Amino acid sequence: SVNTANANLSINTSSTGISIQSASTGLTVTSNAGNGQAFQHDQPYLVFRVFVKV
Amino acid sequence: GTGGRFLRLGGSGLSVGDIGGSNQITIPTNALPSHQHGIPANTHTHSVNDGGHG
């Protein structure tokens, strides 16, 4: 009879052929940045007093 | 001195001869109106690294 025996073999490593194609992050607008506030502005001036003739 | 200014009656809390104002105006930060910027189209890939696997 022939006894059971193992075929002594091993697997040689290979690097898989894998690639990553293009993609878009998907965002299209930013977030609003700004508030509509009243803002004070004054032209140069000099102040007098007005009197109406009676 | 006139100072090349504008004529301003000063009834509300402004004595005679009072000056002020400015020809140069500076937009404050809170005065900026709310707005949204558009983000353009984008596209990218990531390289892949792998030495192999048995």
Side-chain angles (χ1 to χ4, degrees), chain A residues 5 38 46:
Chain A
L46 187 49

Side-chain angles (χ1 to χ4, degrees), chain B residues 30-47:
Chain B
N30 55 10
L32 190 61
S34 192
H35 63 303
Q36 205 141 17
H37 293 261
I39 293 189
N42 28 313
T43 278
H44 67 299
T45 73
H46 310 249
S47 59

Side-chain angles (χ1 to χ4, degrees), chain A residues 25-44:
Chain A
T25 79
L27 42 57
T28 169
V29 305
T30 78
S31 48
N32 278 325
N35 27 53
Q37 284 315 71
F39 146 59
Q40 161 100 43
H41 160 229
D42 287 322
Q43 44 181 339

Side-chain angles (χ1 to χ4, degrees), chain B:
Chain B
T2 77
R5 312 176 85 101
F6 283 82
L7 216 40
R8 178 186 187 177
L9 320 171
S12 306
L14 284 178
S15 62
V16 197
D18 285 337
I19 43 169
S22 193
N23 226 32
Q24 293 331 296
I25 76 193
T26 289
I27 296 285
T29 158
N30 55 10
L32 190 61
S34 192
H35 63 303
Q36 205 141 17
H37 293 261
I39 293 189
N42 28 313
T43 278
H44 67 299
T45 73
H46 310 249
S47 59
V48 60
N49 37 9
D50 51 334
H53 63 298

